C-alpha cells in the first residue's frame, strides 16, 4: 500500500468521518447568536442521529414493552442539520398511551448534564424523545403542545418519536424527527385523507425532518470487526435490487422537480433547477455505486479459475 | 387509430403487436441525447456570433 | 370468453388461429421504465427552454 | 476458564464513542477509563452498559475519585433497577502496571472487579475487547497480582441486535472533503480484504499439509478440494445476459442526469452571459 | 444578589434580585418582562426542585449562585 | 418421494371409515400420498412434463394434470401450467438472485474451513497469524 | 434424485432444457496429486483478491484528486473575482 493508503488512513489524526465528533464552541455561539431560524421557518430539514444514541433509544424504546417511555438527546447544529450526538433515559413511570415526567424526571435532567460536563462532554440538550408502542411514529395534540412550549424557549428543539413494537415485528428501526410551527402561524394553504389517516389531526401543525444516521471510524471498525455476517453481506449485498423501488420513486419525483424547475425558469427565490441538478447526481451516484460492486463482485468471483 | 396490430396479408391473419418497453426507453433516451447534443452546438455557435456582433448589413 | 375480457373479468387475450388462450401471468416491476421515460420527456422539453432563454 | 462473562454490543459502541470523543477534543488519542454494569447471576457474568468516570493525574499515577463515582451509581439506579457494577474499562495495548494499580483502587469499591480493555490501535483481524480478572499470587516475600485472560460470549436481544444490524449495513456514512467513492469502496476494499485473509491462511494450511508441518487431515483437504471446485460462480450464459442488462440500465441512467448536469450547466453559464452581453 | 439561571439547551439569564423577594413578585416580573408560564416552569437548585411552600431562608446562597429552568415534558 | 410398495404395510392398520373409495377406484390413502408426492416433487424440479410426472404417480396423463391445478388457485404449492406443450414449471430462478446465493456459501465454506483449521492444530493457526503480517 | 435424497449432491433438474443444476456438492477423496491443483486455484484466487484491492485503491486516489482539483479551480476563481472588487472600493 506504502505512499497511497499510509495517508488515507492516517489512525493519528481525525479522518473526515470523525470531523461531525469536533465541537467548536465559537461556532456555535456563533450560529446561536445568529438566530437564523427565527427570520425562516422550515430552515431545520435534516437531522442526523450518531449510531450510539440510535442504539440507546432504540433499547430504551423496547425495554418498556407496552409502555410509553421518554428521555432527552444531547447534540448541536450546523446549517440546517441538527445533530445529535448522544442521549440519556430518564427515570420516569408510564402507561401504555401516557408518560407525564412528574418530579423525579426534572431533577434527573439537571443533575445528569452536570455530571455529565464534569467527564468531557461539551454538548447541550438539543431534543427530547418519547416512544409510542403500537401506533406509528407522529406527534398528538398534547405532543404538539409540549413541542411549541420547548420550542418558543429553547429554539433549537426536535421531538423524536420511536416505536418499538412495527421495529421488532418488521426488523427495520421505525424513528421519526418533527419540528413544529409558531402557535397561530403560517397556515400554509387523496393526500389529505392519508395524511390524517397516519399522522394527527395537527397534520399542518408540524413537520418531519429527513432522518439520517452516522458512525465514526472506530465504530464501523469494531461493527465490521464484531461478525462475519457483515463482510460475507457485503460480497453478496446485490445493490439495484434491494432498494430498486426507492430509486424508481426517486426518478419519479425527480421528474416532477424538473417540471416545477422548468415551469420555474421559464419566467419564492429558491433556484428549483440546481436541487433537482443535486438530487439527480446523488440517485445517479448511487446507480453507478451499485453497478462497481457488482463489478468488484463480478471480477473477484466470476473471473477465477477460468 | 387504437389499434395495435400487424395484418399478415400472407394467410390473412392479424396479428397483435406489443411494443418491448425496455427497448423503447433505450431507443427515445438516446434520441434525446443526440437531439440536445445538436442544440447545444448550435447554441456555442450562437454565442459566438452574437459576441462578435456579426449581422448582414 | 370475450364478453369476461371486455368486461376486465378475465386477464388474458384468445388465439383464434390456433383455439388458444393465453393468460396475463405478465406485468412485473417494470415501473422503472416508466419512469425513465417520464426523466426523458422531461429532459426533453426542459433542454428547448434553457437554449431559448433569450436567443 | 474461571467465570463465564457474556458482552453486549453497547459497551463497545460506549468505549469508541468515549475514545473518539477524547481523541477529537485533546487532538491526540488519549487513555480513557469508564466503569461497566451489568448483571451477575451466579457463575454468568452479564455486560449491558456501561458510564464514564472521573480520573484525576498526580505524577505518574491515576487515582479514581469515588463521590463521583457514586453520585452515578445513584444516578444509573433510578433507570436501571436491576443492574449492579461489575468492573471497569480501558483503552490501550497490553495490561501495563497503571492498570494494576487503578485495578487494586477499584478492589475497594467491589469485591471481584472485571477488567475490559478494547485496543483501538490494533493491526490484526481479531476483535480488540478483551476481557480480564485479577488473580491474588502467595509468592514468596511481596505480594502481587496478576491479571489472568478470560473467554467472553457476545449475546445479544432483539433490540440490540436490530440497531446493530442497521448501523453495521448502511455504508452512506460519509461527510466533507472526501467523496462518496472513498467512502464506499474503503467498505469494499475492507471486505474484500478480510475474504483474502481468510483465504490466504487456507493456502497457507494446505501448503503446510502438503509439504509436512502439519498432519495429513484427509476431511479438510476433500472440503478444500470442494472449496475449490464452486470458484467459477455462476459462469453461465443466462447470468451474463443479466450482468449486460444491469450495466445497460445502469449506464442509461448515467446518461439521464449526465444530460440534466450539462443542462444545469448551460442555464448557468447562459445566465452569467446575459448580464454580461446584454444587447439593450 | 446575583442570580444566574440557565435552560438546559445552553441559554443564559442573569438577573440582580433582592435576597428575600417573594416568589410571586418575581413571578410577577418575569411575567411582564419575558411571559414563560409559571405553571411550566420547573426550578432546580444543586439537583432538588424548589418546594413552594418554603422560603428561600435555608437556602444560603451568597455569589455565583446556579438555578436550572426546565420546561414541562409530556408524551402519548 | 413416498412409493406405493412401502405403504402396503400401513393401509392395514387403518380404520375400517378411513379406507373408503371415493367411487373412482383410488382410496383416501393413495389420494393424500399423490398430492404428498406431488408437492416433494416440485422441490426437486423446475419443470417436468406430464408424461414423465404420471410416472412417478401413475396417474399418466389425465388425472396429473387435474391434481397439479387442483393444489394451485388454493395456496397449496406454487406454479403455472402449459398445457399446449404440457409442461409444469413450478419455480424457476432469476439468476442474480442465484449469483448472490452461491457467493454467500462460498464465504460460508471458507469461514467453516477456517474454522477446523484453528480447531485441529491450534497452535500452527497462531503463528500463521503473526506471520501474515511478513 | 435419490443421489439427492443422500444430499452428496444438491440442486433441481430442468426437463425442458435437459440440464441438471447443482448447486452444491461433496468434495471427493484426494491423492497426492490433486494437492498441487488446490494450491494452483487458491493462489489464483489470492492474486485475484489482490489486483481488485490494488485496482480499488487506485480508483480512490484518482477520484480523490479529481476532487482536490475542482475545489482548488472553484476557489481560485473566487479569489480573482474579490481582489478587483476591493480595488475600487475606496
Same mark, same amino acid.
Given at each position: 500500500?506504502?505512499?497511497?493508503?499510509?495517508?488515507?488512513?492516517?489512525?493519528?489524526?481525525?479522518?473526515?468521518?470523525?470531523?461531525?465528533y469536533?465541537?467548536?464552541?465559537?461556532?456555535?455561539?456563533?450560529?446561536?447568536?445568529?438566530?437564523?431560524?427565527?427570520k425562516?421557518?422550515?430552515?431545520?430539514?435534516?437531522?442526523?442521529?450518531?449510531?450510539?444514541?440510535?442504539?440507546?433509544?432504540?433499547?430504551?424504546?423496547?425495554s418498556?414493552?407496552?409502555l410509553?417511555?421518554?428521555g432527552?438527546?444531547?447534540?448541536?447544529?450546523?446549517?440546517?442539520?441538527?445533530?445529535?450526538?448522544?442521549?440519556?433515559?430518564?427515570?420516569?413511570?408510564?402507561?401504555?398511551?401516557?408518560?407525564?415526567?412528574?418530579?423525579?424526571?426534572?431533577?434527573?435532567?439537571?443533575?445528569?448534564?452536570?455530571?455529565?460536563?464534569?467527564?468531557?462532554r461539551?454538548?447541550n440538550?438539543?431534543?427530547?424523545?418519547?416512544s409510542?408502542?403500537?401506533?406509528?411514529?407522529?406527534?398528538?395534540?398534547?405532543?404538539?403542545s409540549?413541542?411549541?412550549?420547548?420550542?418558543?424557549?429553547?429554539?433549537?428543539?426536535?421531538?423524536?418519536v420511536?416505536?418499538?413494537?412495527?421495529?421488532?415485528?418488521?426488523?427495520?428501526?421505525?424513528?421519526?424527527?418533527?419540528?413544529?410551527?409558531?402557535?397561530?402561524?403560517?397556515?400554509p394553504?387523496?393526500?389529505?385523507?392519508?395524511?390524517?389517516?397516519?399522522?394527527?389531526?395537527?397534520?399542518?401543525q408540524?413537520?418531519?425532518?429527513?432522518?439520517?444516521?452516522?458512525?465514526?471510524?472506530?465504530?464501523?471498525?469494531?461493527?465490521?470487526?464484531?461478525?462475519?455476517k457483515?463482510?460475507?453481506?457485503?460480497?453478496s449485498?446485490?445493490?439495484?435490487?434491494?432498494?430498486?423501488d426507492?430509486?424508481?420513486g426517486?426518478?419519479?419525483?425527480?421528474?416532477?422537480?424538473?417540471?416545477?424547475?422548468?415551469?420555474?425558469?421559464?419566467?419564492?427565490?429558491?433556484?428549483?433547477?440546481?436541487?433537482?441538478?443535486?438530487?439527480?447526481?446523488?440517485?445517479?451516484?448511487?446507480?453507478?455505486?451499485?453497478?462497481?460492486?457488482?463489478?468488484?463482485?463480478?471480477?473477484?468471483?466470476?473471473?477465477?479459475?477460468? | 387509430?387504437?389499434?395495435?396490430?400487424?395484418?399478415?396479408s400472407?394467410?390473412?391473419?392479424?396479428?397483435?403487436?406489443?411494443?418491448?418497453?425496455?427497448?423503447?426507453?433505450?431507443?427515445?433516451?438516446?434520441?434525446?441525447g443526440?437531439?440536445?447534443?445538436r442544440?447545444?452546438?448550435?447554441?456555442?455557435?450562437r454565442a459566438?456570433?452574437?459576441?462578435?456582433?456579426?449581422?448582414?448589413? | 370468453?370475450?364478453?369476461?375480457?371486455?368486461?376486465?373479468?378475465?386477464?388474458?387475450?384468445?388465439?383464434?388461429?390456433?383455439q388458444?388462450?393465453?393468460?396475463?401471468?405478465?406485468?412485473?416491476?417494470?415501473?422503472?421504465?416508466?419512469?425513465?421515460?417520464?426523466?426523458?420527456?422531461?429532459?426533453?422539453?426542459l433542454n428547448?427552454?434553457?437554449?431559448?432563454?433569450?436567443? | 476458564?474461571?467465570?463465564?462473562?457474556?458482552?453486549?454490543?453497547?459497551v463497545?459502541?460506549?468505549?469508541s464513542?468515549?475514545?473518539?470523543?477524547?481523541?477529537?477534543?485533546?487532538?491526540?488519542?488519549?487513555?480513557?477509563?469508564? $466503569?461497566?454494569?451489568?448483571?451477575?447471576?451466579?457463575?454468568?457474568?452479564?455486560?449491558?452498559?456501561?458510564?464514564?468516570?472521573?480520573?484525576?493525574?498526580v505524577?505518574?499515577?491515576?487515582?479514581?475519585?469515588?463521590?463521583?463515582?457514586?453520585?452515578?451509581?445513584?444516578?444509573?439506579?433510578?433507570?436501571?433497577?436491576?443492574?449492579?457494577?461489575?468492573?471497569?474499562?480501558?483503552?490501550?495495548?497490553?495490561?501495563?502496571?497503571?492498570?494494576?494499580?487503578?485495578h487494586?483502587?477499584?478492589?475497594?469499591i467491589?469485591e471481584?472487579?472485571?477488567?475490559?480493555?478494547?485496543?483501538?490501535?490494533?493491526?490484526?483481524?481479531?476483535?480488540?475487547?478483551?476481557?480480564?480478572?485479577?488473580?491474588?499470587?502467595?509468592?514468596?516475600?511481596?505480594?502481587?497480582?496478576?491479571f489472568?485472560?478470560?473467554?467472553?460470549?457476545? $449475546?445479544?436481544?432483539?433490540?440490540?441486535?436490530?440497531?446493530?444490524?442497521?448501523?453495521?449495513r448502511?455504508?452512506?456514512?460519509?461527510s466533507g472533503?472526501?467523496?462518496?467513492?472513498?467512502?464506499?469502496?474503503?467498505?469494499?476494499?475492507?471486505a474484500?480484504?478480510?475474504?483474502?485473509?481468510?483465504?490466504?491462511?487456507?493456502?497457507?494450511?494446505?501448503?503446510?499439509?502438503? $509439504?509436512?508441518?502439519?498432519?495429513?487431515?484427509?476431511e479438510?483437504?476433500?472440503?478444500?478440494? $470442494?472449496?475449490?471446485?464452486?470458484?467459477?460462480?455462476?459462469?453461465?450464459?443466462?447470468?451474463?445476459?443479466?450482468?449486460?442488462?444491469?450495466?445497460?440500465?445502469?449506464?442509461?441512467?448515467?446518461?439521464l442526469?449526465?444530460?440534466?448536469?450539462?443542462?444545469?450547466?448551460?442555464?448557468?453559464?447562459?445566465?452569467?452571459?446575459?448580464?454580461?452581453?446584454?444587447?439593450? | 444578589?446575583?442570580?444566574?439561571?440557565?435552560?438546559?439547551?445552553?441559554?443564559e439569564?442573569?438577573?440582580?434580585?433582592?435576597?428575600?423577594?417573594?416568589?410571586?413578585?418575581?413571578?410577577?416580573?418575569?411575567?411582564?418582562?419575558?411571559?414563560?408560564?409559571?405553571?411550566?416552569?420547573?426550578?432546580?437548585?444543586?439537583?432538588?426542585?424548589?418546594?413552594?411552600?418554603?422560603?428561600?431562608?435555608?437556602?444560603?446562597?451568597?455569589?455565583?449562585?446556579?438555578?436550572?429552568?426546565?420546561?414541562?415534558?409530556?408524551?402519548? | 418421494?413416498?412409493?406405493?410398495?412401502?405403504?402396503?404395510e400401513?393401509?392395514?392398520?387403518?380404520?375400517?371409515?378411513?379406507?373408503?373409495?371415493?367411487?373412482?377406484?383410488?382410496?383416501? &390413502?393413495?389420494?393424500?400420498?399423490?398430492?404428498?408426492?406431488?408437492? !416433494?416433487? !416440485?422441490?426437486?424440479?423446475?419443470?417436468?412434463?406430464?408424461?414423465?410426472?404420471?410416472? &412417478?404417480?401413475?396417474?399418466?396423463?389425465?388425472?396429473?394434470?387435474?391434481i397439479?391445478?387442483?393444489?394451485?388457485?388454493?395456496?397449496?404449492?406454487?406454479?403455472?401450467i402449459?398445457?399446449?406443450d404440457?409442461?409444469?414449471?413450478?419455480?424457476?430462478?432469476?439468476? &442474480?438472485?442465484?449469483?448472490?446465493?452461491?457467493i454467500?456459501?462460498?464465504?460460508?465454506?471458507?469461514?467453516?474451513?477456517?474454522?477446523?483449521?484453528?480447531?485441529?492444530?491450534?497452535e500452527?493457526?497462531?503463528?500463521?497469524?503473526?506471520?501474515?503480517?511478513? | 434424485?435419490?443421489?439427492?435424497? @443422500?444430499?452428496?449432491?444438491?440442486?433441481?433438474?430442468?426437463?425442458?432444457?435437459?440440464?441438471?443444476?447443482?448447486?452444491?456438492?461433496?468434495?471427493?477423496?484426494?491423492?497426492?496429486?490433486?494437492?498441487?491443483?488446490?494450491?494452483? @486455484?487458491?493462489?489464483?484466487?489470492?492474486?485475484?483478491?489482490?489486483?481488485?484491492?490494488?485496482?480499488?485503491?487506485?480508483?480512490?486516489?484518482?477520484?480523490?484528486?479529481?476532487k482536490?482539483?475542482?475545489?482548488? @479551480?472553484?476557489?481560485?476563481?473566487?479569489?480573482?473575482?474579490?481582489?478587483?472588487?476591493? @480595488?475600487?472600493?475606496?
Open positions: 500500500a506504502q505512499k497511497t493508503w499510509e495517508l488515507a488512513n492516517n489512525m493519528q489524526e481525525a479522518q473526515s468521518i470523525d470531523e461531525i469536533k465541537y467548536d464552541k465559537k461556532q456555535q455561539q456563533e450560529i446561536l447568536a445568529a438566530k437564523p431560524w427565527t425562516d421557518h422550515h430552515y431545520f430539514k435534516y437531522c442526523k442521529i450518531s449510531a450510539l444514541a440510535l442504539l440507546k433509544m432504540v433499547m430504551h424504546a423496547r418498556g414493552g407496552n410509553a417511555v421518554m432527552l438527546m444531547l447534540g448541536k447544529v450546523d446549517g440546517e442539520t441538527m445533530i445529535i450526538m448522544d442521549s440519556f433515559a430518564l427515570p420516569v413511570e408510564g402507561t401504555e398511551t401516557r408518560v407525564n415526567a412528574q418530579a423525579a424526571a426534572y431533577e434527573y435532567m439537571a443533575a445528569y448534564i452536570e455530571n455529565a460536563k464534569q467527564v468531557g461539551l454538548e440538550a438539543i431534543g427530547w424523545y418519547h409510542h408502542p403500537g401506533y406509528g411514529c407522529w406527534l398528538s395534540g398534547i405532543n404538539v409540549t413541542q411549541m412550549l420547548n420550542q418558543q424557549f429553547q429554539e433549537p428543539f426536535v421531538a423524536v420511536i416505536d418499538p413494537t412495527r421495529t421488532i415485528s418488521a426488523g427495520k428501526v421505525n424513528l421519526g424527527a418533527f419540528r413544529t410551527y409558531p402557535k397561530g402561524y403560517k397556515p394553504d387523496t393526500i389529505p385523507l392519508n395524511k390524517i389517516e397516519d399522522f394527527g389531526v395537527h397534520c399542518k408540524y413537520y418531519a425532518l429527513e432522518v439520517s444516521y452516522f458512525k465514526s471510524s472506530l465504530d464501523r471498525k469494531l461493527l465490521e470487526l464484531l461478525w462475519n457483515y463482510w460475507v453481506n457485503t460480497l449485498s446485490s445493490s439495484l435490487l434491494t432498494n430498486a426507492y430509486t424508481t426517486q426518478v419519479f419525483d425527480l421528474s416532477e422537480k424538473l417540471e416545477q424547475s422548468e415551469a420555474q425558469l421559464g419566467r419564492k427565490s429558491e433556484d428549483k433547477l440546481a436541487k433537482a441538478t443535486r438530487d439527480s447526481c446523488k440517485t445517479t451516484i448511487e446507480a453507478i455505486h451499485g453497478l462497481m460492486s457488482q463489478v468488484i463482485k463480478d471480477k473477484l468471483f466470476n473471473q477465477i479459475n477460468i | 387509430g387504437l389499434i395495435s396490430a400487424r395484418v399478415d400472407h394467410s390473412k391473419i392479424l396479428y397483435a403487436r406489443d411494443v418491448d418497453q425496455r427497448s423503447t426507453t433505450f431507443e427515445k433516451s438516446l434520441l434525446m443526440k437531439e440536445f447534443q442544440r447545444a452546438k448550435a447554441m456555442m455557435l459566438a456570433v452574437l459576441r462578435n456582433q456579426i449581422h448582414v448589413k | 370468453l370475450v364478453q369476461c375480457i371486455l368486461d376486465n373479468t378475465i386477464h388474458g387475450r384468445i388465439d383464434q388461429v390456433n388458444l388462450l393465453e393468460l396475463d401471468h405478465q406485468k412485473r416491476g417494470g415501473a422503472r421504465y416508466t419512469a425513465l421515460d417520464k426523466w426523458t420527456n422531461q429532459l426533453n422539453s428547448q427552454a434553457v437554449v431559448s432563454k433569450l436567443a | 476458564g474461571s467465570v463465564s462473562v457474556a458482552l453486549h454490543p453497547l463497545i459502541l460506549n468505549i464513542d468515549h475514545w473518539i470523543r477524547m481523541r477529537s477534543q485533546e487532538g491526540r488519542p488519549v487513555q480513557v477509563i469508564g $466503569a461497566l454494569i451489568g448483571k451477575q447471576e451466579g457463575r454468568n457474568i452479564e455486560v449491558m452498559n456501561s458510564f464514564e468516570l472521573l480520573s484525576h493525574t505524577e505518574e499515577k491515576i487515582i479514581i475519585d469515588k463521590e463521583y463515582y457514586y453520585t452515578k451509581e445513584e444516578q444509573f439506579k433510578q433507570v436501571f433497577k436491576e443492574l449492579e457494577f461489575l468492573g471497569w474499562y480501558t483503552t490501550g495495548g497490553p495490561p501495563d502496571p497503571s492498570d494494576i494499580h487503578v487494586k483502587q477499584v478492589c475497594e467491589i471481584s472487579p472485571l477488567f475490559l480493555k478494547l485496543n483501538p490501535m490494533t493491526k490484526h483481524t481479531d476483535l480488540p475487547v478483551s476481557v480480564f480478572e485479577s488473580v491474588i499470587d502467595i509468592i514468596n516475600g511481596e505480594a502481587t497480582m496478576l489472568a485472560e478470560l473467554t467472553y460470549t457476545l $449475546a445479544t436481544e432483539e433490540a440490540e441486535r436490530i440497531g446493530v444490524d442497521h448501523v453495521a448502511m455504508t452512506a456514512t460519509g472533503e472526501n467523496s462518496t467513492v472513498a467512502e464506499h469502496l474503503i467498505a469494499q476494499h475492507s474484500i480484504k478480510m475474504l483474502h485473509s481468510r483465504v490466504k491462511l487456507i493456502l497457507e494450511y494446505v501448503k503446510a499439509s502438503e $509439504a509436512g508441518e502439519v498432519p495429513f487431515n484427509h479438510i483437504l476433500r472440503e478444500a478440494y $470442494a472449496l475449490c471446485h464452486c470458484l467459477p460462480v455462476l459462469s453461465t450464459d443466462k447470468f451474463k445476459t443479466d450482468f449486460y442488462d444491469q450495466c445497460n440500465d445502469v449506464g442509461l441512467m448515467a446518461y442526469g449526465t444530460i440534466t448536469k450539462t443542462c444545469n450547466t448551460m442555464n448557468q453559464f447562459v445566465n452569467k452571459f446575459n448580464v454580461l452581453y446584454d444587447r439593450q | 444578589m446575583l442570580i444566574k439561571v440557565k435552560t438546559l439547551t445552553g441559554k439569564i442573569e438577573i440582580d434580585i433582592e435576597p428575600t423577594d417573594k416568589v410571586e413578585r418575581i413571578k410577577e416580573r418575569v411575567e411582564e418582562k419575558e411571559g414563560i408560564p409559571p405553571q411550566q416552569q420547573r426550578l432546580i437548585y444543586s439537583g432538588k426542585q424548589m418546594n413552594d411552600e418554603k422560603t428561600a431562608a435555608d437556602y444560603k446562597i451568597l455569589g455565583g449562585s446556579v438555578l436550572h429552568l426546565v420546561l414541562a415534558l409530556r408524551g402519548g | 418421494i413416498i412409493r406405493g410398495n412401502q405403504l402396503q400401513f393401509a392395514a392398520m387403518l380404520m375400517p371409515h378411513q379406507k373408503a373409495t371415493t367411487a373412482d377406484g383410488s382410496s383416501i &390413502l393413495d389420494r393424500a400420498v399423490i398430492e404428498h408426492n406431488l408437492l !416433494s416433487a !416440485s422441490k426437486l424440479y423446475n419443470n417436468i412434463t406430464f408424461e414423465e410426472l404420471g410416472a &412417478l404417480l401413475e396417474i399418466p396423463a389425465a388425472k396429473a394434470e387435474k397439479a391445478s387442483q393444489m394451485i388457485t388454493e395456496g397449496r404449492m406454487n406454479g403455472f402449459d398445457q399446449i404440457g409442461i409444469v414449471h413450478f419455480e424457476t430462478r432469476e439468476a &442474480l438472485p442465484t449469483w448472490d446465493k452461491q454467500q456459501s462460498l464465504c460460508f465454506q471458507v469461514n467453516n474451513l477456517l474454522e477446523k483449521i484453528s480447531q485441529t492444530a491450534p500452527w493457526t497462531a503463528q500463521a497469524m503473526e506471520a501474515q503480517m511478513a | 434424485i435419490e443421489a439427492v435424497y @443422500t444430499d452428496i449432491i444438491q440442486g433441481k433438474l430442468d426437463q425442458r432444457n435437459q440440464l441438471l443444476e447443482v448447486d452444491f456438492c461433496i468434495g471427493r477423496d484426494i491423492r497426492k496429486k490433486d494437492i498441487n491443483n488446490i494450491v494452483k @486455484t487458491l493462489h489464483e484466487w489470492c492474486d485475484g483478491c489482490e489486483a481488485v484491492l490494488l485496482g480499488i485503491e487506485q480508483q480512490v486516489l484518482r477520484a480523490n484528486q479529481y482536490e482539483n475542482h475545489n482548488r @479551480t472553484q476557489q481560485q476563481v473566487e479569489a480573482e473575482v474579490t481582489n478587483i472588487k476591493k @480595488t475600487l472600493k475606496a
